[PDB]
Design a protein around this ligand. Sequence first.
Ligand SMILES: CCCCCCCCCCC(CCCCCCCCCC)(CO[C@H]1O[C@@H](CO)[C@H](O[C@@H]2O[C@@H](CO)[C@H](O)[C@@H](O)[C@@H]2O)[C@@H](O)[C@@H]1O)CO[C@H]1O[C@@H](CO)[C@H](O[C@@H]2O[C@@H](CO)[C@H](O)[C@@H](O)[C@@H]2O)[C@@H](O)[C@H]1O
Ligand SMILES: CCCCCCCCCCC(CCCCCCCCCC)(CO[C@H]1O[C@@H](CO)[C@H](O[C@@H]2O[C@@H](CO)[C@H](O)[C@@H](O)[C@@H]2O)[C@@H](O)[C@@H]1O)CO[C@H]1O[C@@H](CO)[C@H](O[C@@H]2O[C@@H](CO)[C@H](O)[C@@H](O)[C@@H]2O)[C@@H](O)[C@H]1O
Ligand SMILES: CCCCCCCCCCC(CCCCCCCCCC)(CO[C@H]1O[C@@H](CO)[C@H](O[C@@H]2O[C@@H](CO)[C@H](O)[C@@H](O)[C@@H]2O)[C@@H](O)[C@@H]1O)CO[C@H]1O[C@@H](CO)[C@H](O[C@@H]2O[C@@H](CO)[C@H](O)[C@@H](O)[C@@H]2O)[C@@H](O)[C@H]1O
Ligand SMILES: CCCCCCCCCCC(CCCCCCCCCC)(CO[C@H]1O[C@@H](CO)[C@H](O[C@@H]2O[C@@H](CO)[C@H](O)[C@@H](O)[C@@H]2O)[C@@H](O)[C@@H]1O)CO[C@H]1O[C@@H](CO)[C@H](O[C@@H]2O[C@@H](CO)[C@H](O)[C@@H](O)[C@@H]2O)[C@@H](O)[C@H]1O
Ligand SMILES: CCCCCCCCCCC(CCCCCCCCCC)(CO[C@H]1O[C@@H](CO)[C@H](O[C@@H]2O[C@@H](CO)[C@H](O)[C@@H](O)[C@@H]2O)[C@@H](O)[C@@H]1O)CO[C@H]1O[C@@H](CO)[C@H](O[C@@H]2O[C@@H](CO)[C@H](O)[C@@H](O)[C@@H]2O)[C@@H](O)[C@H]1O
Ligand SMILES: CCCCCCCCCCC(CCCCCCCCCC)(CO[C@H]1O[C@@H](CO)[C@H](O[C@@H]2O[C@@H](CO)[C@H](O)[C@@H](O)[C@@H]2O)[C@@H](O)[C@@H]1O)CO[C@H]1O[C@@H](CO)[C@H](O[C@@H]2O[C@@H](CO)[C@H](O)[C@@H](O)[C@@H]2O)[C@@H](O)[C@H]1O
Lengths: 424, 424, 424
Amino acid sequence: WANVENLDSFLQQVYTYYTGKGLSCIIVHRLFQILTVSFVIGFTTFITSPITYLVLWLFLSFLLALWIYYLTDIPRLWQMREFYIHALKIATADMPTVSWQRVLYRLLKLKKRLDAYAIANRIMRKDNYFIALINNGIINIELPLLHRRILTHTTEWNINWCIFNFVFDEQGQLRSAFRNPNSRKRLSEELRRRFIVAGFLNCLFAPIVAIYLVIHNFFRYFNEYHKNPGALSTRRYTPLALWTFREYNELQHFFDERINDSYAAASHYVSQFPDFNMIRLFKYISFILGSFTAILVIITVFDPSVLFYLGLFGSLIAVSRSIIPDETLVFAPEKALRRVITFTHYMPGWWSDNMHSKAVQQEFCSLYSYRIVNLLWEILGILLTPVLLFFTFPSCSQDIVDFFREHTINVEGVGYVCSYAVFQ
Amino acid sequence: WANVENLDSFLQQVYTYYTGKGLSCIIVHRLFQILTVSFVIGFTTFITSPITYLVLWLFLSFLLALWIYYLTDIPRLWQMREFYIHALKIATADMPTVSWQRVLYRLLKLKKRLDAYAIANRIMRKDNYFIALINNGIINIELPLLHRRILTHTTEWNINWCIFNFVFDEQGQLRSAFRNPNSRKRLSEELRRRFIVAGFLNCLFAPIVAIYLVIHNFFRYFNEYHKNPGALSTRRYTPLALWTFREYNELQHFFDERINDSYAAASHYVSQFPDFNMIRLFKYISFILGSFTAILVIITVFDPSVLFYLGLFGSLIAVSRSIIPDETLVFAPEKALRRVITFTHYMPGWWSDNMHSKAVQQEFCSLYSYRIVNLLWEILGILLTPVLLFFTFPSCSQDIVDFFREHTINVEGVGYVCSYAVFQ
Amino acid sequence: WANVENLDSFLQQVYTYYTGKGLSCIIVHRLFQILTVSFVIGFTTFITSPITYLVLWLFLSFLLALWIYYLTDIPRLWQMREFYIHALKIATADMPTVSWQRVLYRLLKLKKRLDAYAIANRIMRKDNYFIALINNGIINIELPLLHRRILTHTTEWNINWCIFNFVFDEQGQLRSAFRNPNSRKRLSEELRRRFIVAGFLNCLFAPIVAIYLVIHNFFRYFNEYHKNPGALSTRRYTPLALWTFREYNELQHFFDERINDSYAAASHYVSQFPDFNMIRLFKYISFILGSFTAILVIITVFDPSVLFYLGLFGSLIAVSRSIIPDETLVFAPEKALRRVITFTHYMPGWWSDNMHSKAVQQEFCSLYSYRIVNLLWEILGILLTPVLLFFTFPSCSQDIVDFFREHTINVEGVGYVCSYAVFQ
Ligand SMILES: CCCCCCCCCCC(CCCCCCCCCC)(CO[C@H]1O[C@@H](CO)[C@H](O[C@@H]2O[C@@H](CO)[C@H](O)[C@@H](O)[C@@H]2O)[C@@H](O)[C@@H]1O)CO[C@H]1O[C@@H](CO)[C@H](O[C@@H]2O[C@@H](CO)[C@H](O)[C@@H](O)[C@@H]2O)[C@@H](O)[C@H]1O
Ligand SMILES: CCCCCCCCCCC(CCCCCCCCCC)(CO[C@H]1O[C@@H](CO)[C@H](O[C@@H]2O[C@@H](CO)[C@H](O)[C@@H](O)[C@@H]2O)[C@@H](O)[C@@H]1O)CO[C@H]1O[C@@H](CO)[C@H](O[C@@H]2O[C@@H](CO)[C@H](O)[C@@H](O)[C@@H]2O)[C@@H](O)[C@H]1O
Ligand SMILES: CCCCCCCCCCC(CCCCCCCCCC)(CO[C@H]1O[C@@H](CO)[C@H](O[C@@H]2O[C@@H](CO)[C@H](O)[C@@H](O)[C@@H]2O)[C@@H](O)[C@@H]1O)CO[C@H]1O[C@@H](CO)[C@H](O[C@@H]2O[C@@H](CO)[C@H](O)[C@@H](O)[C@@H]2O)[C@@H](O)[C@H]1O
Ligand SMILES: CCCCCCCCCCC(CCCCCCCCCC)(CO[C@H]1O[C@@H](CO)[C@H](O[C@@H]2O[C@@H](CO)[C@H](O)[C@@H](O)[C@@H]2O)[C@@H](O)[C@@H]1O)CO[C@H]1O[C@@H](CO)[C@H](O[C@@H]2O[C@@H](CO)[C@H](O)[C@@H](O)[C@@H]2O)[C@@H](O)[C@H]1O
Ligand SMILES: CCCCCCCCCCC(CCCCCCCCCC)(CO[C@H]1O[C@@H](CO)[C@H](O[C@@H]2O[C@@H](CO)[C@H](O)[C@@H](O)[C@@H]2O)[C@@H](O)[C@@H]1O)CO[C@H]1O[C@@H](CO)[C@H](O[C@@H]2O[C@@H](CO)[C@H](O)[C@@H](O)[C@@H]2O)[C@@H](O)[C@H]1O
Ligand SMILES: CCCCCCCCCCC(CCCCCCCCCC)(CO[C@H]1O[C@@H](CO)[C@H](O[C@@H]2O[C@@H](CO)[C@H](O)[C@@H](O)[C@@H]2O)[C@@H](O)[C@@H]1O)CO[C@H]1O[C@@H](CO)[C@H](O[C@@H]2O[C@@H](CO)[C@H](O)[C@@H](O)[C@@H]2O)[C@@H](O)[C@H]1O
């Protein structure tokens, strides 16, 4: 590896081999991914059975492209596995459980600079620019009519292809033409001619991706969402909430740990806002039905459709007892919210006034939505991303170019990084 | 509010509007309260159907008095809601979740002194005297024959009407005649002529209140206590335990929070005292029945009323497994008790010797009783309070007067407070 | 002050009015400064008494220029005094003792951003670039032949006139042409044509400044350095040591406090390196002379030029006792050095190996020199600065330009600051 001369991509591959947990796990996951896609395709073309033949040929050609890419990438995985076993001296059996600090320790042992912070800046060199574009509103992801900021996975794929393939070298570093203030008019017009091409390609590949996605999600979740409604209120952070919470140089797996360790706190928080005027009503109704049931039971022990009424009242009382919280339950929304914020690290300025508020809870529930709503939006966004790539993104092209010139700072030994990554 | 000149009652109304959680919640609770009373009355007069007409007229006249009082009080609630929205700038939607410290912050912003501690001393000016009368034995609430200290809700209503209406101004402050040591013989005899009148009124309104209370509690709890015995061992603090734990100037909702946050610790503590000589016996019996069942099952797999015996033994073994605790369970009564005391703040002097003891647990279970026992005593105390108001309270009248003269201290900017409130 | 539009210079004037401690103290100091200069001139032209008339006319013309400038600047001082009394509400009697945090508090009360850190970045906007040029070797201040880094006060005056008058606006901010990478060849050649002009002016004003300086220092220090040699070993930090210790955005008076609070630690540290092979010799010599003196005193009490020998031996023994340290004295150079570094905040990388070392002490004594050596070098540097401005500075001109383009970062609300000021 002494002849890399492309240290950024090498470190990124080291990291994605770590988070993939070795060649075995990576190959297994990719295999089951293409198997799931192919099963969806085959089962959908079976239960429904010219135009059908042509669209099936299209789908299977995409599947074969995926397969061919995976087969092409296998050798790079082997090179990295060899680098892990031999150079890093990390056992193939230690992969699913070794930490990133241990890999960093071995990597510093093996060998301008390779500090932990430097390696984080080199792995996340483009992700930091993405965090800074999204969080600072440099790029407008708000729909023109629906008035909503949506960040699907196709949105960020298109952002990474239009911008970060155009702004960064093949060697993976900010091109020279993006700090020259005189070229700000040529680049800011060769960038709209990329947004337009990506919008054209998405207007062709977005229907046949949203269709596959809705079919896959239906097949996967129909069983649970019609035979287990308890798992219908499972809440998760929206994909835009996961880029609002992200910090700079915070590698993906650290972020995943500290976000998964926050769902307990968030589920607790969103429950600290009961409806007392409704709890009181249901307490009253439970009292009435309990009086009726007491009379009925005390009269049936002396005269053995009163059983229908007894069953109905038992059902209604069991319904009511679920709404009525425990007596010895202390509701404290502000400390629940602070317990959440110790994980999400995200407290807007105007929260600090009223963290007990209900408006704060409305906002946090805009960030922490239902999983089914997240699915509906991850399907509608694949359709509405061409709207962005045609109407809101070109108008924001100039700014983007300027953002890469103003807010780029040279950190010695790393290179040109985002200027926001060096503050926080 | 610049023309109040009755700051104590104004602050008390601010506080009870806070703890009632706004005009909406207060009105809803009062409405469902009169609805529950009226439903009990109507259903009891229905399932049972002169004397009946007369007693029904009496009950409905009391109900109408309650209704008329609530309708009379509504305008004061509106005045306070206006003061909350306009002057305090607390949103009507922030009421169920705003804290008392936020209300104090707004109230100090708006405007002798209005510190947090001063407002607590003005809201709890009579409650501090009550805590000091009850905890220091100035007033004797021990029954003459049953030899038990009972503090029902009617007991404290009678104490607040006999004493605190006679001792405190209409403006809500210690009358002047109660610090003059020469009038200690006139006041200590105009106070027995109040205990006697209250005893006479209670000997008339105590039967028709205990009757309503037992009917209400029967209707409410018969369903749960005959169809869910698991909620028969629900333990709660007796009303006298809640005045023993109360601290001075600790507003009601803080006390409620720290008492509700103690039921987990108390339930844990009362379980750290198993019967080892009984656990051993049930372990032996489970072993015997398991041997029998093993033989029976191993003999029925070769010869398919042995099923009756198998079912009976399964039932008995399931019974036995519930008593036998887990093996890896560590019983530690002293640290459980300390975990409780960190909430109740109540450790008598003689506990500090043996907090591992069983006598300490007997006392704490006198404080932390069963809810059904609490109901039986809250019904028997409504009957036995005239005994107090006739025989034990007059004999303790003199002391009471002296208590208000000796143990009153003038805190500057607040007024005459209890001398115990300023120590702890 | 709402119409300033030159916030940087306004804040710098606020700060220099604070550190000057009011109009009274500023005027008094300037007055005694011109009085000291004029006294030196008059006394030197008196004790020595064409060429004399001409050089005296030159000196007095410089004095009159200084006087005229002070008289010109008085009105700005009055404007700032009014701003301090009226707007800031800081009493004229509170000036010599008010802190900078109190001035910051008042200034934030009065009114893109005016945080403490922002005001520090605006006051020290050019000083941060100076710290970064000097500490990072962007500019070469090492003499070509003597091989020594000298930073006189004239050196930094010339740096501030050649560079910071050319690089920064009249409004006080980095000119636009210094971030355009295409103009790096025009600016890097209009900067050598400034170093050359400054070298020419210094080759004319350096003799008649070094002469005045040596005369002033002779007059001031001859008395103390010939009639009090105890104040000849007074050590101070060299002017280059005071730019090596300086941190970014550390205002001048904070730096002065933490450097003055370090001279005790430095004086302690430089004494932890005694010469044991010399202490032993002087102990032996003191023993010999004490034996001789004991014999002489015990023989003169029986036979009253032995007195000459007794006096000489007393003198030599008094000399020896000064070198020999106390017995109960514990020498610990490493913790003395750490006590120093807690103030200077300056520990090179190669110190961390051997902080007990003698080479570390040699380096620290290169930083912490004798005051008389500092005077000799502050006089020789005024002569040798044209050498820098002619031979070492032009060769380093290009780099300087690049330094202002590479290492400039835009902090929002402040402006273009040095990129090193935002790290540490
Ligand atoms: C005719 C078929 C049409 C569509 C086919 C299927 C859709 C496309 C799938 C392909 C592909 C993009 C890349 C292709 C690049 C190959 C080059 C192509 C040829 C170029 C010549 C999907 O990538 C995205 O697909 C999205 C759906 O399309 C998913 O959205 C979801 O929607 C809802 C669903 O439940 C969800 O609720 C919602 O939460 C999602 O937002 C995303 O989750 C996913 O990231 C695969 O790449 C990626 O897949 C993901 C796991 O998916 C892998 O994540 C992790 O990997 C390990 C960490 O390294 C971890 O250890 C591992 O734990 C983890 O899995 C990635 O590593 C990577 O492998
Ligand atoms: C009709 C056939 C359907 C075919 C659909 C397209 C098939 C091609 C997909 C291939 C392709 C898009 C590229 C070409 C797209 C051109 C326009 C596409 C328009 C559609 C016509 C998607 O593939 C990527 O998708 C990403 C999203 O899941 C995954 O990131 C996961 O996220 C976490 C989840 O939370 C997981 O936890 C984590 O383990 C994964 O990292 C990747 O693992 C995956 O490889 C590969 O490019 C990718 O390069 C890299 C940056 O160089 C970017 O990957 C990530 O970005 C950050 C995000 O988080 C991550 O921080 C960072 O880790 C990573 O850098 C992507 O931006 C993407 O650009
Ligand atoms: C012909 C009918 C005969 C009897 C009728 C019903 C009995 C009397 C009910 C009337 C009334 C006294 C005041 C009357 C003043 C009006 C003036 C009258 C006209 C004057 C011209 C009951 O007051 C007491 O009644 C006792 C029973 O009698 C209860 O004992 C119980 O027994 C067992 C039961 O389950 C229990 O197990 C046991 O734990 C109890 O000890 C007590 O809990 C209760 O305090 C109503 O006042 C009070 O009610 C209570 C909630 O009850 C309100 O508490 C809170 O309010 C909010 C904080 O501000 C909170 O936010 C809210 O959460 C909370 O609710 C108070 O605010 C206040 O409203
Ligand atoms: C045949 C028809 C049946 C009619 C029965 C009587 C109907 C009249 C009841 C009306 C009346 C009694 C007054 C007249 C009684 C005369 C003799 C009665 C003999 C019966 C013939 C009861 O009404 C009160 O009862 C209290 C008890 O629940 C409630 O306090 C709740 O406690 C917590 C629970 O734990 C809750 O959490 C909390 O939210 C509530 O505060 C009050 O909310 C309620 O208003 C109103 O007067 C009341 O004034 C105030 C102090 O000026 C006192 O209230 C409280 O005291 C402290 C205790 O804790 C509290 O610290 C303090 O907050 C408050 O100051 C009472 O002492 C009482 O005197
Ligand atoms: C024909 C005569 C030839 C020469 C004349 C005399 C030499 C020049 C003197 C003028 C002048 C430069 C500025 C002129 C600007 C006016 C505009 C001109 C007209 C433009 C149209 C000297 O400035 C420098 O002069 C150097 C010598 O030249 C000194 O070097 C010394 O050498 C050895 C000596 O002992 C030393 O050992 C060695 O340690 C030094 O390095 C430096 O100490 C001094 O900084 C005055 O400016 C500055 O003086 C200094 C105190 O001097 C003031 O420092 C502080 O002020 C307060 C904090 O705000 C503090 O509260 C106050 O405590 C403190 O005092 C500054 O505020 C400022 O006022
Ligand atoms: C034949 C007649 C002799 C006439 C000789 C020249 C007379 C002119 C002198 C006037 C002039 C030089 C300007 C023109 C020079 C052109 C070329 C000169 C060639 C000579 C032919 C010197 O005047 C300054 O000299 C400084 C040095 O003492 C003083 O700083 C003191 O340092 C501490 C000590 O340790 C004291 O503690 C502290 O209180 C003082 O701040 C200043 O107080 C003083 O005003 C005024 O310009 C000045 O502007 C400012 C930055 O805008 C700079 O001041 C400081 O720089 C940092 C340093 O530390 C400081 O951090 C910072 O506080 C301040 O910003 C200077 O760089 C200088 O440029």
